Design a protein around this nucleic acid. Structure first.
Ligand SMILES: [Mg+2]
Ligand SMILES: [Mg+2]
Ligand SMILES: [Mg+2]
Ligand SMILES: [Mg+2]
Ligand SMILES: [Mg+2]
Ligand SMILES: [Mg+2]
Ligand SMILES: [Mg+2]
Ligand SMILES: [Mg+2]
Ligand SMILES: [Mg+2]
Ligand SMILES: [Mg+2]
Ligand SMILES: [Mg+2]
Ligand SMILES: [Mg+2]
Ligand SMILES: [Mg+2]
Ligand SMILES: [Mg+2]
Ligand SMILES: [Mg+2]
Ligand SMILES: [Mg+2]
Ligand SMILES: [Mg+2]
Ligand SMILES: [Mg+2]
Ligand SMILES: [Mg+2]
Ligand SMILES: [Mg+2]
Ligand SMILES: [Mg+2]
Ligand SMILES: [Mg+2]
Ligand SMILES: [Mg+2]
Ligand SMILES: [Mg+2]
Ligand SMILES: [Mg+2]
Ligand SMILES: [Mg+2]
Ligand SMILES: [Mg+2]
Ligand SMILES: [Mg+2]
Ligand SMILES: [Mg+2]
Ligand SMILES: [Mg+2]
Ligand SMILES: [Mg+2]
Ligand SMILES: [Mg+2]
Ligand SMILES: [Mg+2]
Ligand SMILES: [Mg+2]
Ligand SMILES: [Mg+2]
Ligand SMILES: [Mg+2]
Ligand SMILES: [Mg+2]
Ligand SMILES: [Mg+2]
Ligand SMILES: [Mg+2]
Ligand SMILES: [Mg+2]
Ligand SMILES: [Mg+2]
Ligand SMILES: [Mg+2]
Ligand SMILES: [Mg+2]
Ligand SMILES: [Mg+2]
Ligand SMILES: [Mg+2]
Ligand SMILES: [Mg+2]
Ligand SMILES: [Mg+2]
Ligand SMILES: [Mg+2]
Ligand SMILES: [Mg+2]
Ligand SMILES: [Mg+2]
Ligand SMILES: [Mg+2]
Ligand SMILES: [Mg+2]
Lengths: 203, 260, 141
RNA sequence: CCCGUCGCUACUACCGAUUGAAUGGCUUAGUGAGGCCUCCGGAUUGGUUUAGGGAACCGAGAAGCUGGUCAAACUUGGUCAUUUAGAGGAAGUAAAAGUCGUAACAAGGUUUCCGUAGGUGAACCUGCGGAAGGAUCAU
RNA sequence: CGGCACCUUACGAGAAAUCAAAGUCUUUGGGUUCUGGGGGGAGUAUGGUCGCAAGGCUGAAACUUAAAGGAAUUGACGGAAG
RNA sequence: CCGGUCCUGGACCCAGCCGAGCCUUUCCUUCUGGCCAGGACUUUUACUUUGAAAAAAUUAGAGUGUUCAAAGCAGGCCUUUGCUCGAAUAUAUUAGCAUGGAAUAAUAGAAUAGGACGUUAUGGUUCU
RNA sequence: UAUCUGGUUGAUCCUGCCAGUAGUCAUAUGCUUGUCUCAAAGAUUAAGCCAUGCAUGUCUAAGUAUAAGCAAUUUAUACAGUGAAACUGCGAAUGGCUCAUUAAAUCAGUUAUCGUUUAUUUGAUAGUAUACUUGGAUAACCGUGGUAAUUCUAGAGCUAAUACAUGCUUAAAAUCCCGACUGUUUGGAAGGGAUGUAUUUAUUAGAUAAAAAUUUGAUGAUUCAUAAUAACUUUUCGAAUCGCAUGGCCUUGUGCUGGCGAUGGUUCAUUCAAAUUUCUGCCCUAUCAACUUUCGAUGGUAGGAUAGUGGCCUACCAUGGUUUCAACGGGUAACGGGGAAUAAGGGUUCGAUUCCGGAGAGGGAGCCUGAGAAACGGCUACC
RNA sequence: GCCGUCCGGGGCACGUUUAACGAUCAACUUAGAACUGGUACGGACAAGGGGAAUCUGACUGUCUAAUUAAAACAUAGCAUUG
């Protein structure tokens, strides 16, 4: 079937190579998972040595890390917005490694407000204004307020990340290989890497 | 081709077994075990070709199935068990203890040892590294894994294994002046002291060894086994000849005097 | 020449620059010495280029054979071809004949090579169809 | 001593209309078995199992279906390679010394030979320019 | 000093004719290019390439054959000389 | 030569042949622990020496009365409730590896000096 | 044994071939053939076609026995000896054969894996935040059969496991997070969650030039080993197993404890391997001088796939890569090597064939199972 | 006096060739992908059949209006004559 052998190629000098031997099983390839977004569907693959691989054919959620905050949460994946390899993966919402996706921001917002006491997005709407006061008026003990007060000053995050919380969706890049491990994990875009992909998206 | 080989042609067997050409088509293929195939001695060869206790391969299996043969203090019933350098073979029915040490002719000598010396063995440290949960361990030349070693032990050192508990009694650091036996190459079986270790980053380190007769030879560090803390003080009994290589003319002279 | 010239963001893997850090806003850079007495060029320690195949700033390791040759082609991006000349002995005639072999080597942006230089290449894992060596030292010619 | 046409016999190879023939390799295009992956599907078969008749809702799951992938094989065409037929044509060699002459070897009876170009039953002859391997190392 | 040659000798070379190079080569090595491997078939067939053509350059095989050939000696012969 | 003779062993003596080590204006890397062990530098080769490697069988070759021999890797001891020599050693050869030598044959250097030493030369700019 | 001899002429000296001469682990064939030892042998032409038979099976005290099998009455009314048949496990990927393909391919020597998988062997390694021991299938078996025919199997009724699918039993602390209340100069805290090991991410240790105004391994070298934090997972496995002995303590209850072993199990190491891999080296041919790049050719970035590296494949992007030091193409009556014959030296010729490596099982191709096969005494399809 | 543009000077600052960027406007060409359908699609219109050879005239061109378009005539080229 699909073969990874180098015998079928022509040499560096351009010479066609004669047929040496029949295709061997230890040089096989298989077909791409083409992971989509949908209710979870994972198929196991029996690989060399009796080991196991997992084809993620469909996933909804994944484990995403906030690198600056050192916190990881499981959150939904909304869709694929950019792919450096093929634009057809963006059009068809195909999850591969290094794909830029939008993830649900609520688990990280919940951690942030509970950890610092402030709010994110900074929108001025009525719901945003009511929620901003709601978090600031939350009932806490004296020790908790002091614990939050110690964490203050470090609670100011980058503007380009804070701004995203208003839409309820953060930009992230997939770090795992869904067709190899069945996981669709990644990290939240930050710093100049986020600035790089922001220019790509707006164009 | 499609999987591991299970046969060994007689002509392709290691030459130090000293098998004859015409006794058959095949040779005993050593099992997987503590020692490499090329550097081992299957118990069938030892019990039949060396000691001549068994007359054929059927009889050596009868011997081992009665629980007589012990290698390193444990009963082995595998006729092709790969016994190797420094291994102790015990036959308590005959009240005999052997140690597999190379003689100067390149073969495994039939070296009988006392019961007190048969209670331990030496192992060359191949690597020192940390296991799971951060527990350091040592891998010896015979595949043994000893946990919690002395933090001073490094590679190329020699440890003394208690061989009944498997622990380390004490060790010898690899350094100039240490007693050494060569376990590979054409200088196999020779015994001398380290004179100078010559380092080659990315390649093979070379060790200069001086014989007791002030003969100097060079061999790879991988073929060097520290067996004593200094000259004339080995931690195991050496085989007859003391690992001193004689020229063919000297051997001819020695044989003439020995026989008259 | 800019580092971010590809459709993907170029960065060293697992080298994290925390935006919520002190004022020393310098992108954290990883590098290593390859051993065997080869000096790390400061263009790798102090540079900004990203090269996963660089011996000093990338993840390749130098192990195996060390070769020297004359650069005969720099027309590929980050890849050169060196020419190794040797004499082959012909025992019947008790003489030699000149022969040559072309070796493709990867060159990191830490080095600047032109056709005619003498370079020292160390063996690495296969990083291309024809490339197994990676430039370690350059001598102007 | 000796050369070449012409005539007889035998053998070898060559050219040759036949868009000759046969065999094998590579390949374009078309068709395309089968496996694998995927997509639904849901024969029947266990209850997350709930239900006053039982309605569910959970799992496993065959045939089959969708789209891919590897791709045998066949048809057509091209090309390469190897054998082979052929009216007729033109050679070579061997055999015998058959017919015609006597071109060469003597200054071989016109010195011979080379290149070239014409001519001619055949050897050959003639022109132009060379060579001596000349029949002159010399006036 | 450079040339075109010549005369004598043969240390030396060669099968000899002859050769100051055709010597310094079985006492075998200063550097380097090209060419030949018994006589024919044959510089033919075929392919390529150059040419307007004539032709040039490159270039086989089947088959056939015990010699073909070089230099010199004696003789015989000559429509050669004395 | 001594002679030192139970063919054989010593300073002295003569020569010869190899290796050294210093001095001659003097190459032979350089520091720390203190020739071995721990750092910093290094024109590129070719060639040759030595070493390691080049599987066993085959070849050459040591031992050994297979009755001789081709072979084989056996075997031998006064006859053994066991004693005991062995199963050598060379060759491989281009490539790669380590090493000594520096003739022979290449290669590089200080000419618009952008040259070399200042070990603790005088400052200055930086970096850890 | 570092050797020559006959043949051109009337005779001579040469060039030169023809012929003679000797060997062949070199084949055939003719004639002849008493003894001993040793011993090749359908390679060459047809990797052409095959009747028939055999060539791969396997049980220990220790997985599963109600054979309606045999045997004996015995420590035994749960079984207990032996033991077909079946289920389970393992092997069948070794061996043996052949030399068609194959000309930088294979192969040889030499490297590398800091680029991977590895049944088995051998060492280590797991107290982790209904239990006096869980379920329901199925074979063999019994009896209803269908087909001309096969190592075809279908209904129906049983019944087991180290098969299949699930599931508890446990140290001592300690640490981290949230945190009602509280102290009230920032401490104390009830109560909740989290801890083993695997998986997948992200982020931190993983240091190491010598005096003045607390640890930290290896390597030539790593983002290595290992540890930590936050989470993650169609939740990996941390023994519902088997044989022999039956001991010790009394709180004499089928009380609590416990000896040698089988088999199994996670990870690391080891071993047997495998897969890629560095350098150098192949016969003839120019009547083969340019080849490769549509539709991967050379390189870059990202991905996919793989056990893993890699144009291995995909997308985008550059225009590269080899070559008179012979590329590319063609031929080979070409598997490579160790080696063989002959040999003064140098060489020439051969190597299908006792060993090593490769490839194939009529020709292709595709796969299942498995640690390992693109297997053919396995399957699927085509010719 | 108003509010703008005309000239024109004061310096703080802003451009030195990373304008490799922004703003506005604008024509139809080319290439790729997905989906889709009774596999249809240059959907009407428009629009070469092709190959192997022989005779003959080289070719383009010309003539028998009203039966012959051809191989006939002409032609460039060649040659001859005054
Ligand atoms: Mg071919
Ligand atoms: Mg595993
Ligand atoms: Mg192999
Ligand atoms: Mg076994
Ligand atoms: Mg190494
Ligand atoms: Mg020679
Ligand atoms: Mg026809
Ligand atoms: Mg096709
Ligand atoms: Mg051909
Ligand atoms: Mg005449
Ligand atoms: Mg006349
Ligand atoms: Mg005449
Ligand atoms: Mg005439
Ligand atoms: Mg003479
Ligand atoms: Mg003269
Ligand atoms: Mg002259
Ligand atoms: Mg000839
Ligand atoms: Mg003559
Ligand atoms: Mg000291
Ligand atoms: Mg050998
Ligand atoms: Mg060598
Ligand atoms: Mg003659
Ligand atoms: Mg005669
Ligand atoms: Mg002959
Ligand atoms: Mg003969
Ligand atoms: Mg037969
Ligand atoms: Mg055979
Ligand atoms: Mg029974
Ligand atoms: Mg087993
Ligand atoms: Mg096999
Ligand atoms: Mg070729
Ligand atoms: Mg184990
Ligand atoms: Mg049933
Ligand atoms: Mg199980
Ligand atoms: Mg990649
Ligand atoms: Mg790439
Ligand atoms: Mg592509
Ligand atoms: Mg061959
Ligand atoms: Mg062949
Ligand atoms: Mg062979
Ligand atoms: Mg053959
Ligand atoms: Mg074989
Ligand atoms: Mg057959
Ligand atoms: Mg078949
Ligand atoms: Mg097959
Ligand atoms: Mg068969
Ligand atoms: Mg088979
Ligand atoms: Mg016309
Ligand atoms: Mg026109
Ligand atoms: Mg008309
Ligand atoms: Mg008309
Ligand atoms: Mg006309």
């Amino acid at each position: 079937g699909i073969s990874r052998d180098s015998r079928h190629k022509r040499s560096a000098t351009g010479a066609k190579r004669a047929q040496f031997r029949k295709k061997r099983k230890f040089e096989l390839g298989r077909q791409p998972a083409n992971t989509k977004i949908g209710p979870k569907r994972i198929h196991s693959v029996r690989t060399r040595g009796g080991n196991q691989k997992f084809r993620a054919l469909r996933v909804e959620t994944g484990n995403f890390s906030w690198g600056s905050e050192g916190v990881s949460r499981k959150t939904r994946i909304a869709g694929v917005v950019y792919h450096p390899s093929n634009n057809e993966l963006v059009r068809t919402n195909t999850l591969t490694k290094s794909a830029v996706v939008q993830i649900d921001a609520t688990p990280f917002r919940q951690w942030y407000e509970n950890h610092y006491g402030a709010t994110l997005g900074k929108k001025k709407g009525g719901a945003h204004a009511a929620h901003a006061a709601e978090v600031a008026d939350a009932k806490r003990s004296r020790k908790v307020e002091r614990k939050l007060a110690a964490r203050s000053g470090a609670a100011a995050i980058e503007s380009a990340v804070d701004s995203q919380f208003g839409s309820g969706r953060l930009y992230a890049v997939i770090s795992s290989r869904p067709g190899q491990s069945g996981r669709c994990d990644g990290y939240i875009l930050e710093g100049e890497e986020l600035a790089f992909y922001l220019r790509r998206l707006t164009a | 081709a499609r999987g591991p080989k299970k046969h060994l042609k007689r002509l392709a067997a290691p030459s130090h077994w000293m098998l004859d050409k015409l006794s058959g088509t095949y040779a005993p293929r050593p099992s997987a075990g503590p020692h490499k195939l090329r550097e081992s001695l299957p118990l069938v060869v030892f019990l039949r070709n060396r000691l001549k206790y068994a007359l054929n391969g059927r009889e050596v299996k009868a011997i081992m199935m009665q629980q007589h043969v012990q290698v390193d203090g444990k009963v082995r019933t595998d006729t092709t068990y790969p016994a190797g350098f420094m291994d102790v073979i015990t036959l308590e029915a005959t009240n005999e203890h052997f140690r597999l040490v190379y003689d100067v002719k390149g073969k495994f000598a039939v070296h009988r040892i006392s019961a007190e010396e048969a209670a331990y063995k030496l192992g060359k440290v191949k690597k020192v590294q940390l296991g799971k949960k951060g527990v350091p361990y040592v891998v010896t030349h015979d595949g043994r894994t000893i946990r919690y070693p002395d933090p001073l032990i490094r590679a190329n050192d020699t440890v003394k294994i208690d061989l009944a508990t498997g622990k380390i009694d004490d060790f010898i650091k690899f350094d100039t002046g240490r007693l050494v036996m060569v376990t590979g190459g054409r200088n196999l079986g020779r015994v001398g002291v380290i004179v100078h270790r010559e380092k080659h980053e990315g390649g093979f380190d070379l060790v200069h060894i001086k014989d007791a007769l002030e003969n100097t030879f060079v061999t790879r560090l991988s073929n060097v086994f520290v067996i004593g803390t200094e000259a004339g003080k080995p931690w195991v009994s050496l085989p007859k000849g003391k690992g001193i290589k004689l020229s063919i003319s000297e051997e001819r002279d020695r044989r003439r005097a020995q026989q008259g | 020449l800019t580092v971010q010239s590809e459709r993907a963001f170029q960065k060293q893997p697992h080298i994290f620059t925390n935006p919520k850090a002190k004022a020393n806003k310098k992108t954290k850079r990883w590098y290593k010495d390859v051993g065997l007495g080869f000096k790390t060029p400061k263009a790798a320690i102090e540079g900004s280029y990203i090269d996963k195949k660089c011996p000093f700033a990338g993840t390749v390791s130098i192990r195996g054979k060390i070769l020297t040759g004359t650069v005969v082609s720099t027309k590929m991006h980050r890849t050169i071809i060196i020419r190794r000349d040797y004499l082959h002995y012909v025992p019947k005639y008790n003489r030699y004949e000149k022969r040559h072999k072309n070796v493709a080597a990867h060159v990191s942006p830490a080095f600047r090579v032109e056709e005619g230089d003498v370079v020292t290449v160390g063996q690495c894992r296969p990083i291309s169809k024809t490339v197994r060596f990676n430039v370690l030292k350059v001598s102007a010619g």
